[PDB]
Structure formats: C-alpha cells, structure tokens
Amino acid sequence: SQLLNYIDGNFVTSASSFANINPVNGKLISDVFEADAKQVNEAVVAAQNALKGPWGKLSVQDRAALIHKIADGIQARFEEFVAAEVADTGRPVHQARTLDIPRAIANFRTFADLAKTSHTDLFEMSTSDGSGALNYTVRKPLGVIGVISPWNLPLLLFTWKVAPALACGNTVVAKPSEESPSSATLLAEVMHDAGVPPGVFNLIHGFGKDSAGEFLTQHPGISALTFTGESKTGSTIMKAVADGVKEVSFALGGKNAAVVFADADLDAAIEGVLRSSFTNSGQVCLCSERVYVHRSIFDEFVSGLKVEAERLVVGYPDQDGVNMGPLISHGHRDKVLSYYRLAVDEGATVVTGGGVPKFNDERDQGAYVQPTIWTGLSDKARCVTEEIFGPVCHISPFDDEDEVINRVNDSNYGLACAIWTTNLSRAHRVSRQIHVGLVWVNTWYLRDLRTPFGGVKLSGLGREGGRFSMDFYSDIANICIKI
Amino acid sequence: SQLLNYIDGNFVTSASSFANINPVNGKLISDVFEADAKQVNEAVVAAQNALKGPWGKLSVQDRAALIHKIADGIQARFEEFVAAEVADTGRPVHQARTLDIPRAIANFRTFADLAKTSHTDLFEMSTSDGSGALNYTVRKPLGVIGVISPWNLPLLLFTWKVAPALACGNTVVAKPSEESPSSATLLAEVMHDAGVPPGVFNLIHGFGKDSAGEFLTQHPGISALTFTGESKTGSTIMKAVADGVKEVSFALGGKNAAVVFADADLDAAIEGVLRSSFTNSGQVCLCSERVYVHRSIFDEFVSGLKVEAERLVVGYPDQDGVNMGPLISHGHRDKVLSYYRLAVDEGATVVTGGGVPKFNDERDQGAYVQPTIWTGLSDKARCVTEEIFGPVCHISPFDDEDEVINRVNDSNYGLACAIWTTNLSRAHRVSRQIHVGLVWVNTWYLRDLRTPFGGVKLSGLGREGGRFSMDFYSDIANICIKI
Amino acid sequence: SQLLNYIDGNFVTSASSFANINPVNGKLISDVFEADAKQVNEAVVAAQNALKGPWGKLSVQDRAALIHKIADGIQARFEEFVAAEVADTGRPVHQARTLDIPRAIANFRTFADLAKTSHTDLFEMSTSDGSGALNYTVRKPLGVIGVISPWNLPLLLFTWKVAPALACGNTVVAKPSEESPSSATLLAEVMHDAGVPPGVFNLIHGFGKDSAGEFLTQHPGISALTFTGESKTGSTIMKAVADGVKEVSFALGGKNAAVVFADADLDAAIEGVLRSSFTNSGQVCLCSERVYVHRSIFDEFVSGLKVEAERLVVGYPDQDGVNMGPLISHGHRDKVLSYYRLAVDEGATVVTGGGVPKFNDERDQGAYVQPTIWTGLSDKARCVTEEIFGPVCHISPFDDEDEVINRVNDSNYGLACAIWTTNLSRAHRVSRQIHVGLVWVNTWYLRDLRTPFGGVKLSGLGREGGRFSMDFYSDIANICIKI
Amino acid sequence: SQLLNYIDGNFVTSASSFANINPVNGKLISDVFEADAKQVNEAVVAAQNALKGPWGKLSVQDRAALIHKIADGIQARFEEFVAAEVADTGRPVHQARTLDIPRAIANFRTFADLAKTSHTDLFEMSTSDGSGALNYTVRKPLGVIGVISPWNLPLLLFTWKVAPALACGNTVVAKPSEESPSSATLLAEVMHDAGVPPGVFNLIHGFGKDSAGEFLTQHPGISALTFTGESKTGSTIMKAVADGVKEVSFALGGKNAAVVFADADLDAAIEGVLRSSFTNSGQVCLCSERVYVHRSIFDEFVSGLKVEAERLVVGYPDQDGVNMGPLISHGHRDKVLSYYRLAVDEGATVVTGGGVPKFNDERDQGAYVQPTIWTGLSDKARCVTEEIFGPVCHISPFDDEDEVINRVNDSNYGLACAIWTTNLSRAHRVSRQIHVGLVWVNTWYLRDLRTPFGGVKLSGLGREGGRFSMDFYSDIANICIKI
Ligand SMILES: NC(=O)c1ccc[n+]([C@@H]2O[C@H](COP(=O)([O-])OP(=O)(O)OC[C@H]3O[C@@H](n4cnc5c(N)ncnc54)[C@H](O)[C@@H]3O)[C@@H](O)[C@H]2O)c1
C-alpha cells in the first residue's frame, strides 16, 4: 500500500518514501511519500490561493453543508476507516469503532453546526459631539491553518483541528504523524470525492526536524500553527513561528493525577483508574500516570487494581475480549521499557507488569508491553514526574485534603486530573483548586465538544473547543462606525 | 528626582542607575535605579507568594473595590500624573489631561467592573448509563503576570495591562520603558497608599536585553508575558518564553492606512488624517503612515492636508495652542530622520516637513521633528512599507475600490485602518475586507474598552479588551461532574 | 371527511365539520373536523403524559436528530405541501416553493441545531464562611406549549412555533387557522411517519371563540400560549390565561411605515416598497401600509410605483408570471373593501386599484382585490392608522428627518419599519430612533432566524428567534450549591 | 410623620390620607397621602416627558454614575433607612442592617454596573445577490415602567425593580405597599437630593383596587408592569394590562418545600429549615412551608427542630437576640391565625406554637404569632397546599427519592426549593428534577444578583436578575442593513 500527499486537489508522490509499520507484528503495511520543502511551499501557496476561490465565496450555510458531507463521506466508509486506524496503531477494533471513528465524524458535525449558529458582538458608545458610535465585531477566516498532529489518536486528533479550521472558512495544510498516516490519507479521498475545492485541504506526509513538519512551521504563508504533542516539540514550534508572529494553539500532554478519597465508591474508582491508566495502552495525554489514594483504603485499592489489571487481554485488535493492543512503535517501546527499568533503579515495588508479554508468534515481533503498576516511589522520583506515555501508573497514599492538592499541583505539567469522592462539598472545593485545564469527578475522559479544552504550565497554551476554537481559527475584527 | 523599584511592599534602590531625559530640552529629570537579575527574582518570588496571601482570599467584589480605590488614588493625584507623563515624554499637557491620565483611570474602573459582572458557562450532556454529566467552567488567576510596556503612551498602556491582570486576581511584575518610568513609579505609590498587599504589584525599572526586561522574560515563575511594542521585540520575547510555554499576548507594529473615497466628507477626512498621522507626534501604533485617496480628490486633499499640517504648533507641552511635542528621545529621532532622508533617496516629493524645526532656544537640544507628508513613492518603497513611528504619512491616489483594498492589505502588518466615506454600503462592504484587527469609519482612535483589540500578521497575536482580557489573564478551567 | 385532528398518535374525526374554501374560485376543498372541549382536553392530557414518556427520555442529540427527521419528512413530500398551501390560500405556486415551504423546513433545522449548541451559565460567589457557592442555570422543557397560528403564512408561522417548542423538549397542542388547516394536517402525517411518540405533537382544528382556540387558551394543563395574529385577539388570549399565570409570547398587528429619503436609490426603493406593500397580497404583518417619501422625489416615486403596481399579474397560482393571488377569504375581502370605500370617503386620491379585478371566469367567485395606492390623506385618517391587511399603501410626503421619525412613531402599533437611504450616518442614526422591534435598511423582510423578532406597544409582547425562543420555550432554573 | 407622593420633581399631598401602623405595638407612625386617578395620570405623563428631557440625553456611563450617586445617598442615610424599614414592619434591626438596606444599595450598584458592561449582538448573513447583510441588536428604554411592590421586603423588592428600570434608561411610576410606605418615600428624597431629573422617578401611595395601584395598571401611558406579590393579584394585573398588551414580569406566591435526605448533615439541615421557615416571621415568598424528611431521621429531625424553634426570641426589633418580630399587620395576623385553626381542624399535631405569645406589655397590642410546626397532615390538606405566609411549616416523612420529587412538584406553585444532602450525585440529580425556578442545596435564600430569578406555574412568569432584567426593562430592537 502507498500513501501519497494531497496537494491542490491532486494526489502526488515524492522523491523519497518511508515505511509505515504495523506494531502488532512489525510487518510493513505501506510506503509513505515524504513531502519536501518544495512540496510544502506548494501546499501553502495552493491553500492561500484557494481562499480567493469558490471556497471563499461560500455562504456560511453552504460551507457547513459541505462539511456535513465530509462527515457523511466518513460514515459511508466507516469500516475502511476503522481498518485504517487499527492497522497503523494496533488499537482494538472495538475502541476504533466506538471511540476513534465516531469522534472524528462528530468533530466535523459539531463545528459545522457551530459555524451556522455562532454570532458576534455589538457595542454602542457615546461621543463628545453627541452622535455616538457603533462597534461591531466579525469572525473571518484566519487564513492558512498549519496542522501538526500526533500518533496516539490519529483521526480523532487530526479532525479535532481540521474540522474547526474549515468550519471557520480557513484553508488547511495538515501534517499527520509519520507513525499513523493512513486515516488522514483516506480523509483526503473523502475531501476529494465530496468536492472540496482544490487547495482547501492539503495533506503532507513526513517527519518533524529537517522534514515536512519543520518546513510547514517555518513557512511564512501560514497564519496559525495548531499542535498536539510533546511539550518540548511545542516549545520548538513556538520558536519557529516567532519571527512571523503566527497564532499558536498547543495541547502538550503532562503527568496527570487521579485522586481517590476515602469516601469514594471504591469499585467505581478502581474501574475508573484502570481506564484512565491503561486505555489505548496508556498512550493518551489525559491518562493518569500518578495516583493518590487515601491511606485508609490504599492497600485494598491497590489489590483490586492489580486484580483488574491482570484481567486485561493483551493481543490482536480483533482478538476476543481484547483490552489492550501494543505501543505505537519499537522506538516508543524502548523509551517505555527504559522507564520500566528506571522505576526499579529508583526503588519501586512492581505490583504488576514491568516487562513485555510472550506470544511465541508474529506479535513477539510487535511492540507490546504489559500494564504496569508501581508503588513506593518518592514524589521526586523521575518516574513520578516525567511523562512516560505507556500503560503505567504509580500509586501513592495521602492523608490530608490540602496535602494531596499540593502534591497533585507540584508539577511542571497541568493538563488533567480525575477525582473520586461521593461528597458534594468536597468535589467542588477540591476541583477548583487543581492547577490544570481539565478536571473530571467520578469519571474520566468524558468529552462535551463545546467545552474549553487545554492545559496550564508546560501542558499547553490556549484553549480549543466550542467558541474557543471558533475564536482561535478566526480573525476577530472590530469595526467602529462614527455616526 | 529619583525613581525607585517597588518590590514586595517596599521601595528599593539598586546598585546601578540611569538617567531619564526630558525630550523637550535634553535635560536630566531623574535617576532611575535599574533592577538586576536578583531583584527581578525577588519581585517574581514575592508575587508568587502574594497569591497565597490576603490578596488571594479577597472576594471578587472586595478585589474590585480595592481596584476602584487604586483608580481613586490616581484621580486624587491627577495633576502629578499629568506632570510626570509630560516630563518624560514632552507630550502636550492637554493631551495628558484628556487622553492619557483619564484612560489610565478608566482602565482600572472598567476591569474592576468586568471582574464583578463576568461569569462562565454550564454545559449539560447525556451519558451511556442515562444519568448524564455537567461541565462547568471557571476563571481563575493565571498566576504571576509579566508586563513589559512601551514609552509612547506610558501610563495608558501600562495600566491597560495591569488593570485586567489585577482584576482577574493575578499578581504582577511590571517593567515600564526606560524612557518613561515616572508615572509608573507614581502608580506604585498609589498602590502602596491604597493598601494593596505586598507582592501583588511589583515595579522593576530597566532596559530590555541584558537587563530587567530580559530577566523578567526568562523567569520560570511567571505564567504569562503581555507586551505592546516593536514586532521584532515581540518575536524575541516569544522565543524567550517558549521553553516554559508561557501564555503570551502581543500588540505590535503597524503600517496602517487611511483610505479616502470620492464620497467622503473631504474636510472631515482632511482633519481626520491630520489627527491619525500626527497625534502624539506620530508615535502611536495606530497612526496612519499610508494614505490612499481617490484620484478625483487627491490634489485637493493633499493641498488641504499640507495647509493644515503647516498650521500645527510644534512646541512646549504647555505652550498656547500646542499640537505636537518632540519625539521620545534623540535615539528615536536619529531613526526617524534616517527614514526622512531615505524617502528623498527613494524619490519622494516632500510636500511638507522633512527635517527638524529650528527654535533658537533650549528646545534645539531636544528631540523635535517636523510633521512630514510624502507623495510620489511606489508601494514597494521601504518608506511605504516599514514602520517609522514618527509624524509622517505618504499619500497615493487610487481609482477602484477592490484595487485599494488589495493595496491596503499588501503588507506584513495588519493592525488598524481608517476609512472615509458617507456611503452606507461602502462603509460595511469595505471594512470587512480590510485585513486588520481594527477598522474605524469616519473617525480614528475612538476606543470602547469592551471591544476586542489587537492585530493580524506581524501586528500581534491574541486579543485584549473586555472579555478577551478576562480570558487571557485567567486560567480557564473545565470541571466535569459525572452524575 | 378530509382533514382530521391528530391526538395522542391517532387521527380522529369530530362531532361537527366545517368547510375549507379555495379563495381562487370559492370552491370547497375539504371538510375539517372541529375539535370540541373534550377533545381539546384529551390533547392536553396526552401532551402532559408524553413528557413522562420516551420523549422525555431523549438526549438533546437524539431529540435534535428526530427534529431533523421531521424536516427531512417535509422535504420528501415537498410538492404535496406546496399544493396544500396553495389550495388553502391561493398563494402563487412560486412563492410557496421559494418562501413558504422552504422556511418551514428551515425552522425545524435551525432550532434542532440550536438545541444542540445552546448552553447556560455559571456564576461563582463568596459566602460569609469563606467557602463560597456556585450558581448554575439549566434549560428544561416548560411543559405543554399551546400554539395558535394565523392563516397568512400557514406552515411558515405554524412551524416557527412548533420547531422551537419541540426542540426545547416540550410537547405541543397546536390549532391552525380555520382558513388554512391543510399543511398542518400534512405535518401531522410527517410526524406520525417520523416516529414522533404519541402525545408529543397534537393537532386540533376549529375556530377561536367558543371553539378549539378558546378552549386551548382556557385549559390549565398548558404551560404557555404562543400566538401570532390580530392585536385584540392577543388581549383576549392574555386575559384568558391570566388566572393560570401562563407564559405568553405575542406578535400582533402592525401599521408599518416605509421611509424613503432623497438620497435613496430611487429604483431600488420603488421595487422595495412594491414588495413590502403587495407581497402575499399585502397579507403579512410586516407589510408597509404607510409610506413616507421626501418631497423632492415624491411625485416621481409615486409615478414609478403606480407603473410597477399596474404591471402586477393578479391571477391563478400556476398562471404564467403571476405576482399576486387572492385574499384569504370573502369575509376578509369585505373588510378590505370596507377600507377601500372608507379611504375614498376620507378624501383619498386613488392613484391605482381601489376595487376588485373583473376576470370573467371562476376567479370572480374567489376573493381577489386590486393592489391599491392612496395619496392625500391626513396622518389621522383611519385608513392611515388602522391595520387593513390588504394589498394597499398610502403615500405621504415629508420634509425633515425628525418630522418623519415622529410621524412613523405616532402609532399604537410598532412592529416593523423599512428605511431607504444611501447615507451611512443617516441609516444608523434614524434606525435607532424608530419605535419598533424590527428595522430594515434598503431591503424588506430579510430574516435571520437567530435574531430577536417581535414588536412594541400593540404589536406584541416578548421576543422569539434564536436564544429568545430557546428561553421562551424553556423553564429557566437556577441551582445554587453551598460549598 | 407625613408621607407624600413625589410627582414630577415635587412632593405633594392628596385629598385622602391613611394610617401607617407600627405592628410591634399598634401605634400610629404616620399619615400617608393616597394618590387619586388624576395624580397617577400626572405621574405617568411626567414620566413620559422625562424620557425626552436630559435624562434621555445622558450617556450610559453618566446614567450609571448618577445611579451610583443614588446608592451613595442611601448609604449616607443608612440608619434612617434602617429605622424607617423597622418602624413600618417590625423586622429585627439586625436583619434590616444586614439584609434589607444593604441589598437595596447593592441593587442600584449592580444594575448600574450592568448598564455599563452590557452589550448586544451582531449576526452576519448571506443574500442571493452575494452582497450580504448584517443584523445588529440594541437595547433601548422600554418607556415608563410601572412598579407595584409588596410589604414583606419593602426597600429590597422596591429597589429590585426600580434599579434595573433606571439603569436601562426608563422612567418610573412606583407604588409601594400601603403597609410599608416609609423607605420608598425616603428614596424619593434621595433621588431629589441626588439631582435625578423631574419625572424620571415618581412615587405614588395608596392601595390596589380602586386606588393608585389599579389606576397605574390601567393607564395606557405605561409600557410595562413589574409586580411582586400574591398570585391572584398577578392575575388581576395581567388582565388589566391586556388591552394595552403591556410587558409583564411577575414573581408571585409559593408553597415551597424543603427536602432533607438521610445523608444530610442533620444539624445543618435543622438550622437551615429553621431559617427557611421562620426568617422575617415566615413572611418571605421563598420560605419553606412544606418540609419532607426521610423516614429514617424524621423523628430525630422533628425533635431537633422543635427545640431550636422554641429557643427563638420573639419580640422587639432591637431586643437582645431577637429572632422574630411581629407579622406586618393585625389583618395579616387574622389570616394566619385562621390558618392555625384550620390546621387543628384538619387533624394536625401541633409540635410547637400554634398561637400568640403573651408579653404583658405593649407588644400585646402588636401583631405577633408564634413560630409553628405541624405534623401528620396529608399532602392534600389545605394547610399543606395553600400559602399561609407566616412562620409555619408542616413536616412529613418520605421513603423514596422519586417519590419525594413527585410530592414536591405536586403543586400549583413552583417558586423555590431547598434540598439537604451531602451526596454529590444526589444534589445535581435531584435539583434538576424540581419544578421551580430556584433551588438551594445545603443553604437557603443565598442570592447572586446576576442569576435568573423567578417562578413557574402560579408562582410567576418571566425572569429577572442579571441580563434577564436588562432585557425585560429594555426594548430589544433588531436592525437589518442590506449591504
Ligand atoms: N500529549 C500528547 O498527546 C502526545 C502525543 C504524541 C506524543 N507525545 C509525546 O511525545 C513523544 C512521541 O512523539 P514524537 O517523537 O513522535 O513527535 P512529537 O510528539 O514531538 O510530535 C508529534 C508531531 O509533531 C511533528 N514534529 C515533531 N518534531 C517537529 C519539529 N521539530 N517541527 C515541526 N514538527 C514536528 C511530528 O511529525 C509529529 O507528527 C512521546 O514520548 C510522548 O511523551 C505526547
């Protein structure tokens, strides 16, 4: 299989391809053509021009309707999309069918809907001559949106950015992860078949540094760069767009805590932390790699979680009650296994996991690791502080409400946090004191697409979601009429 | 006069001092103690700590009441602030009495009011178990706000940032321009006398590079850097804070155009462009340095603007009928004059000005220049494309509406634009097509502080004003409760 | 037996039937079963019970999807709705295809979308004990919405109420005009086939006083009454529901002015006033029956309008080039001719029309009248102050801006006004001074469904449209949590 | 003491006067002049004219400043307002000093602030000709606001209506309860002294039927009637303004429940129900006259409440530790006692109270009753369904959560509800299911002035507070410009 770039309405190859690997079994699944600096410039110029074409002339309602057709296009090829994400990543067919693909569709539907309903402001004012003035605001396309997306939730995170971008009338140059190029390529076909004017959506394959990612980033023709990924990659990008003073939107992961209070529903919290630690094999930026549990229930909690964790099925995406697939890649497994060892060096008790499963088949050539639970490390340990991005969590006891708040907040990251308690006063009091963008109480990763989404400190900059996306992906202009 | 730093509730000197010069006559007004890296550190640390003190326990209404007291205090020392601003900058006293100090009061009052009125959002959602969930959002203090302000509208631009910062419950470390430190130092006194808690507001004096400005910018204890200034400085600051992924808010350079259509009120437009080109001696980021005038009225408009410009009184701040003061400094005058000769070299006709007035008194040791009008340059001339930030404009004819829209927009800047026309459709049709953040029709620099303010391209990123400031100077947190 | 009621998911007949007449030729179209008190009761109880059924259990997303299905259902039977509308009202077939039916569908689509986008508010407050409290608001179904609709834009106005009613989770009992029950009956079928649960949407036919309308009005089981129609009927309805303190929403009569300034595009204004006076044979609450023209263009405006008026083709709905159909009924024709005679007795000059066309075919049995223009009446003439609701306007000269504002405003009505001018300041300066709910400048009846729609004085109470409808059709509840 | 009307800038007497009685001891406090129909007409006409005077030329900022001046003037006479409120009604001095007078002040300041911050909307749209259109809304004064207020919270409720009315630039004709005329008369003094232009604020005294109140409602010159009070009185008013189609805003009766769940903080719940039943001697529309307590804690709850209720000090407004003053009047006491008798007749157990205290001093000539608790009545007893408006509650056990929801909602009223529970889920799950406008969890009558305030069913129509008042007291107008 070969995955081409999509530039100015044409699928094109490059002067260099690269392997896309299935991490279930290490087998090559396709050659991906790597866009070069020339092709990137070509994509940007084409997106700039397309702003002055038919796309630019579309009414908000026709634009929305076309976006709903992009979404219809995905629905009609649903299983081809499921297959595509599964292949690239190893994610369980069930996850892909219920989480990834439906959310990608909902992204386009939600922001199309918003594009139609959203409105702006009127401000009246008095003036010395007694005639007054009117200020009104409008939202306009920001211009060319640069999109650089990660491998963990490929289509979901790709469309999270492309959808509001197009809904706001922008054009897009989008660079998916080298590891997960398939679903995006399919989207490009959907765009094309749906009659999205050429130059409106441009797909470019490649890597970061000295490759398509960097080139997009250094290109003066774009108006914004929105990115989800590694915090130091965010910092790099920010420096790159600085001379052009481009608008930036970053969601940059973290080291999230779950907190379980003594008055929690223990069984729900055990199940809740299982999901928050090991979903997508712990390759979500929202996952809890840190857990704090009240001393009075620490041992019981750890016990039940170990039990539930060892019940998880690690195998083929289509395997029966499968719960976990592999890591994205071998490189990523090597980093994760590297932390596995560091955890021991650091004094950790390994409650469960700590290595890789054994298959004695093709999967042994994959990139699987085991769900892991550590105990007994210091709050200052590297394993408790640095983001691992694997199916791992360290559990630690706490005694006081203010103590644990202080411990959750003592981090250079602050994306999300999950809190377990049945007490009303407690839930609201504690929630407002956690220094993150996103709190969940008695649940995790529940997403209403209208809400502001993002992080504090190293975990990001700006917010996306609902009107926050409508604002970020638009020029806000103020028009003042003297009367 | 001696201008001290204000750090953790105390006025402090530093090891080194620099001179504050009166641009009217080149005389020394005061010595200004330069904060060093260690003092910058103390200010940041005090500000972090102040967030955990009494300031952090104030209700929103009590916080607002204290902010109104700050504003009362400025009011009570109104003429001192006027004299301070005038001393530093040479601005006409009547401008300081009607624009500068009044706006600085209004900034505090408006954001104190928004602090009390502003609310957040509630989103209900359905879930699988049929019980649903609530998402609600809150605004919290972002933390410590780094403010770095320019010399052109010292107290106005300073308080424009400090007012919302405080209103949103942050603490502040603020560095006013080395050219214009007096009114900020006075403001510190008002802060102290109003009983603002120690560490909440901190004033550090100095320069940019290798000085208080850069130290502030590099300090990891800050949560945000808000800046109005040269766009190249903005880029530098963006790079400096990138490793911390600090929130940023930039209002930067302009090369703003005024457009005068055939159906304009010609006298009103002449008076209008007079003000937009030469207000504050052209030292406003909003000034018009490019002027496009319909062919059929070009010659008359140019003749009218020449006469009106030659009528401008350039002189002392309290001189009868004075319209224009000097430039901020000799250094800035060197730059302006350099453009003045470059314009000749690029082939400009000098309709008026082009040099420095001769007073034959102490003002000759000052930093005055003449209001200056050019004609005859191409749209590619450096003098038509680069920000001068002096009392200057180039005037060029046009024939067609779409033609002029494209010429205005053909720029790496995009801050503001003023349009002159008596035609209803024209005002609205043209304004929405200008690629800037701010348009005025039949007026200029009319400000409603609730409006979103800011630029596109090199002219900035982000918006401030009204709820845009309430969002930028706050952590926006989403709290999701499973029911 | 032709047009049945639709109660609790079944079409049902009644004890008495009445005739539906085609106003093109006076011929009987259908027999309509008049709901009696018992049946009105049955409808309300069933709507009451439906709230406690699966309709009550839908998530906002599923409820929206269902509403979109109702729209799809109307779309699938587009031509049948056209024929139904045309039959009852005599409206030109092209108007039905481009205005009436498309707007009915748009009504459902818009409010379905808003149901999904709309959110509510979060207010934080401090409390004596220093722990604070939260207030959040929610929208819930108000309950059973009683809908009483008029005959002039039958399906458009019917669905303008039903769409938001259903979108906010209410159930409905709706009574269409005795003159135009067909398209509403067809909607009931669409609702049945779409699977809308029984009790959710109920259709009852009949008259006002001593009939289905009155009884709906007097039933204590409804939660609100929303009504479009005559003013005196609004008053009657307001009194009827008073003992129950039911929520009310009224758009009533108007005696709307168009104002034409000397700087208007004269050709566009003539065409504009031709449409605002004669569209739907002048049977729209937004029609202009008063017209004020600046003296310098009066004679020419009048001559222009007369010519264009006499071009209008009055005839069959499917007649080649037809512009105007008949009036709704013979009884309405008699009212309109009563004013046509009064205008003469009051001294009017009849510029054109003033009687009934003679067709020498079945149309002479229908209810046609001529498009009429009067001149020469005083501002206090009855024909100039009372709503006629036919295809007529009086044209009067004016001289001064403040004069014409006062004359427009001197009315017990205040629904809408149209202003023609090319001057920017004038447009905004004058529009804000007109005492109505709706102003159009250089156009007429341009409708954005997000906008607040309603009148002042006798022309109504409350606003509908956008969030105004989402508010009126919902219980707004504040919930305050002590922390 | 003499209490005059204030009409068109002048205090005036009337042909007839009536007595204002102190309910503590039954003594004459003052003579009140009853406005006749001629004088009401004079007030409304002056109010209409005032809209065209200087009041109408004030900028929003200036109008706001003047309203803050009104508030200052009350603050400067703080204790005279305390004395006036206490004299009229017998309320405890501490309640007047902490709730009543401070709220009146906060009313004016809140709405003054909102006047300055509030803005409106901008809606862009496409058109067939491709040029587009824009819609913008504005808020303007509605006109003359009729205000009719009750005696239970005289200045709080009076200024709750007058503040937003003025803040929205309206003029006012206001009629306080004949039982509590004093504070409103002092406010007329403050208005005069503050320079409020003549006709802007008019104070008329008297009764309802055949007196000033009725005449107000019948006057065609008013634009709206806002009213708080008895439900049947709301109905009578709604009918009276029906012919004019005036805007109406009603907060009316309630028979509010408190619900104590088994997981409640039992002592906090007992204190909270004590306050919600007996504050202001049970004379708040928001008081809980029905109480439901889970079976498992019912006996302990009732014992506890008995004890705390018998601790209450009933007596003089400035008496040491006084909890309750008298009822407003002997007539009102007659009503409440007849309900005391009915409760016994209906089978109630009198847990405490049930009569009148014996003072053996001048308070025996006052209108006091005992705080009263009943038990053992059915949900259909008159004393459980009808509003008594005195210091009483009936307590009933429940078993099931859905059961108690149904029981609370089984009412023709629906003003407020208070729920006691420490459980997170329960607070949010149950609160959204209560059919009222206002829910409190673990508190009572905690008021954020920005929130929507009102009732459902017989308990009112519409909402006030925050933007809801800003909309009700304004013409909302949509202005549509074709471009
Ligand atoms: N927070 C998240 O959701 C998230 C997602 C993916 C990866 N990560 C973190 O990052 C690591 C893996 O990510 P990665 O190394 O594959 O890439 P990366 O996370 O740093 O970045 C993701 C995307 O950015 C692009 N990119 C990388 N470097 C760039 C550069 N210098 N300029 C422009 N674009 C660039 C890549 O092509 C890729 O598509 C993990 O260890 C994990 O901790 C976090």
Ligand SMILES: NC(=O)c1ccc[n+]([C@@H]2O[C@H](COP(=O)([O-])OP(=O)(O)OC[C@H]3O[C@@H](n4cnc5c(N)ncnc54)[C@H](O)[C@@H]3O)[C@@H](O)[C@H]2O)c1
């Ligand atoms: N606001 C508008 O757009 C509009 C629409 C139609 C008619 N009108 C005016 O009304 C005049 C008369 O026409 P109409 O009699 O059909 O209008 P109408 O307002 O009296 O009746 C309209 C609707 O209300 C119902 N109704 C009438 N009386 C009622 C009552 N007492 N209680 C409850 N429901 C009642 C009717 O059956 C119908 O459904 C027209 O001449 C015109 O001036 C205004």
Ligand SMILES: *C(=O)/C=C/C=C(\O)C(=O)O
């Ligand atoms: C730049 O020269 C001026 C900036 C002005 C503002 O930011 C303002 O608030 O008016």
Ligand SMILES: *C(=O)/C=C/C=C(\O)C(=O)O
């Ligand atoms: C009255 O005759 C017209 C009312 C029109 C509407 O309500 C509409 O939504 O277009």
Ligand code: NA
């Ligand atoms: Na791969």
Ligand code: NA
């Ligand atoms: Na200086």
Ligand code: NA
């Ligand atoms: Na008919």
Ligand code: NA
């Ligand atoms: Na009294």
